[PDB]
Copies of this chain bind each other. A is one copy, B any other.
């Protein structure tokens, strides 16, 4: 057949950080992890971990073996930077295996550090993260004029795509979901080499087919069904006649390969079924490369700027599709708001409807914390005689060489303090590097993960709050040790975490309208914040901020948190993430932490 097939896998772990350790900012961070032992059955071995992250990192090895039995160039994979780094730290053997496969076996896809929803961040943060993305990926993509790029949850806007495409010289292939396409209908645009103007540059774009991808990832069709859905269901009889190559592109989380013990074999059988149909397995980049080179015949204008299609701003690959009013996706899952009619939605959780209003407040609050930290860094670097915001940007980007040091060392890329400090050479590296650290903690705290789920009380929400609490307190203490009034500006931000439930009033959330009519009510808000653990009456946000504050806060204010908060309920116990329920937890009733 002339049909081409490929899969993309997205690999990411938010990690199990519950407390970041004090540090100088000259080295990668050190931290304590959650102890909530868990196992994943893979075919016929149970893979055990002290927590979800470590179990998964072990599991990545079974996955890499499977990927190794596929042909060269067949699929593409992106690893979130910190996730790949954590593998190097915890299982350096697997890092070497994974790294070899990305150099030689699968096409490597660039992605963003810390997996935030990019359009939910300021342009400043997005620019840093975009440049770091390409920097971190340099050993895999150095001599490639075309590279695929993975936006977290595929949540894209025109502004975000521009930032990304500007952060590189190469040609960018955005991997998206076909439900994000607009200005063309699905069968019209399907399987062709489309492009997408990113206002100045243009990117290639491929959109996955959600229903077949999920049919694999969630085991709803057997191998025969998956093979037929592709080989028959996706056939372009005209292109088969004209002898024109077209690409059927699917995508899932890499962790879908261990969602049940049979997934690795299922995937191998599927790919085998397709090859037997005469379908060549070939990655999105090598597909385009083979088009432009005219090794593959094209339609007139294919892979060009006449084959430009549009993409809906704020569309995604994983939104609540049952609430879509245009047959496309949006970002309502992470904001809690449907944009088309500007209402606040609710979702089911453990037999009750829960307002998703908390996600909006969470997102909004973090925009403010993010800016408080960014302006802190800029203000303090100014005192050191650094006035050029562009030099500060370059510095914050180069600081990746510190944060992910060993990764870069593995490839003999410069990790020298002299490199990192060059754009801001007039500053005390001791102060500058602590600021770089505080900035990267803020970044780390912007994981999209907490707002993916229906309820707020999860281990990932705790981790975000604990990480930003670390950053804020350290920034606050820098201002204190300099005898500045700005120390309180930062303490005010920290206080917004402790008193998180007050934000319903401070944010005028009552003015907003619920989908059904009750989702922006007082009680809707307060119900949604109830603790999901036995041993804490505090909401998860207050919990994590107290948990970190009680160990890092100056004794005097450390006192008021004791006067107003019962500290004994400041522990890392959270509710469970519904998507992780297939795991074998020692404690299934809530996400535990042990002594």
Give CA–CA (A184, B323) in the complex, Å. Answer: 11
Q: Would you mind naming 29 contact pairs between A and B with Cβ atoms under 8 Å apart?
A: A179-B185, A183-B325, A183-B326, A184-B327, A185-B185, A186-B186, A186-B187, A187-B187, A187-B211, A189-B327, A211-B238, A215-B237, A215-B238, A220-B238, A221-B237, A221-B238, A221-B241, A225-B237, A225-B241, A228-B235, A228-B237, A229-B235, A229-B237, A231-B232, A232-B233, A233-B233, A233-B235, A233-B236, A233-B237
Within 8 A of B (CB), among A195-225: 211, 215, 220-221, 225
User: Count the A residues whose beta carbon is within 8 Å of the partner chain — how many?
Assistant: 28
A584 at the interface (CB under 8 A from B): no
A185: B residues at CB distance < 8 A: 179, 185-186, 327-328
A293 at the interface (CB under 8 A from B): no
How distant is A315 from chain B, measured CB to nearest CB, in Å? 12
A430 at the interface (CB under 8 A from B): no
How distant is A207 from chain B, measured CB to nearest CB, in Å? 11
Give CA–CA (A184, B179) in the complex, Å. Answer: 10
- Of all chain B residues, which has the CB nearest A185? B327
Complex interface bits, A230-260 against B, C-beta within 8 A gives 1, otherwise 0: 0111011110010000000000000000000
A32 at the interface (CB under 8 A from B): no
- Of all chain B residues, which has the CB nearest A221? B237
A416 at the interface (CB under 8 A from B): no
A188 at the interface (CB under 8 A from B): yes
- Of all chain B residues, which has the CB nearest A227? B237
How distant is A161 from chain B, measured CB to nearest CB, in Å? 20
B327 adjacent to A183 (CB under 8 Å)? yes
Copies in the complex: 2
- Of all chain B residues, which has the CB nearest A234? B233
Complex interface bits, A164-189 against B, C-beta within 8 A gives 1, otherwise 0: 00000000000000010011111111
A326: B residues at CB distance < 8 A: 182-183
A328: B residues at CB distance < 8 A: 185
Give CA–CA (A186, B185) in the complex, Å. Answer: 7
- Given A186-B187, A188-B327, A325-B183, the answer on whether A235 and B237 have CB atoms closer than 8 Å is no
A229: B residues at CB distance < 8 A: 235, 237
Within 8 A of B (CB), among A327-374: 327-328
A236: B residues at CB distance < 8 A: 233
How distant is A211 from chain B, measured CB to nearest CB, in Å? 8
How distant is A269 from chain B, measured CB to nearest CB, in Å? 16
Give CA–CA (A236, B209) in the complex, Å. Answer: 14
How distant is A330 from chain B, measured CB to nearest CB, in Å? 13
A220: B residues at CB distance < 8 A: 238
Give CA–CA (A233, B241) in the complex, Å. Answer: 14
Give CA–CA (A254, B336) in the complex, Å. Answer: 51
- Of all chain B residues, which has the CB nearest A226? B237
A211: B residues at CB distance < 8 A: 187, 238
A241: B residues at CB distance < 8 A: 221, 225
How distant is A188 from chain B, measured CB to nearest CB, in Å? 5
Give CA–CA (A179, B327) in the complex, Å. Answer: 13
Please list the 3 inter-chain residue pairs (A to B) with the smallest Cβ-Cβ separation, ordered nearest first: A185-B327, A232-B232, A184-B327
How distant is A196 from chain B, measured CB to nearest CB, in Å? 15
Give CA–CA (A237, B216) in the complex, Å. Answer: 13
Residue in A187, A220, A228 whose Cβ sees the most chain B Cβ within 10 Å: A187
A183: B residues at CB distance < 8 A: 325-327
A182: B residues at CB distance < 8 A: 326-327
Residue in A183, A215, A237 whose Cβ sees the most chain B Cβ within 10 Å: A237
Give CA–CA (A185, B187) in the complex, Å. Answer: 10
How distant is A573 from chain B, measured CB to nearest CB, in Å? 38
How distant is A181 from chain B, measured CB to nearest CB, in Å? 8
Give CA–CA (A232, B3) in the complex, Å. Answer: 14
Give CA–CA (A179, B236) in the complex, Å. Answer: 18
Give CA–CA (A179, B221) in the complex, Å. Answer: 29
A231: B residues at CB distance < 8 A: 232
- Of all chain B residues, which has the CB nearest A321? B188
Residue in A189, A215, A235, A325 whose Cβ sees the most chain B Cβ within 10 Å: A235
Give CA–CA (A43, B235) in the complex, Å. Answer: 32
How distant is A27 from chain B, measured CB to nearest CB, in Å? 50
Give CA–CA (A238, B218) in the complex, Å. Answer: 14
Give CA–CA (A249, B505) in the complex, Å. Answer: 54
Starting from the known contacts A183-B325, A229-B237, A231-B232, 19 additional A-B residue pairs (CB-CB under 8 Å) come to A179-B185, A182-B326, A182-B327, A183-B326, A183-B327, A184-B327, A185-B185, A185-B327, A186-B186, A187-B211, A188-B327, A189-B327, A211-B238, A215-B237, A221-B238, A229-B235, A232-B232, A232-B235, A233-B237
A235: B residues at CB distance < 8 A: 228-229, 232-233
How distant is A187 from chain B, measured CB to nearest CB, in Å? 6
- Of all chain B residues, which has the CB nearest A229? B237
- Of all chain B residues, which has the CB nearest A225? B237
How distant is A313 from chain B, measured CB to nearest CB, in Å? 16
A233: B residues at CB distance < 8 A: 232-233, 235-237
A232: B residues at CB distance < 8 A: 231-233, 235
Residue in A185, A228, A232, A238 whose Cβ sees the most chain B Cβ within 10 Å: A185
Give CA–CA (A186, B179) in the complex, Å. Answer: 10
A188: B residues at CB distance < 8 A: 327
- Of all chain B residues, which has the CB nearest A309? B327
Complex interface bits, A377-388 against B, C-beta within 8 A gives 1, otherwise 0: 000000000000
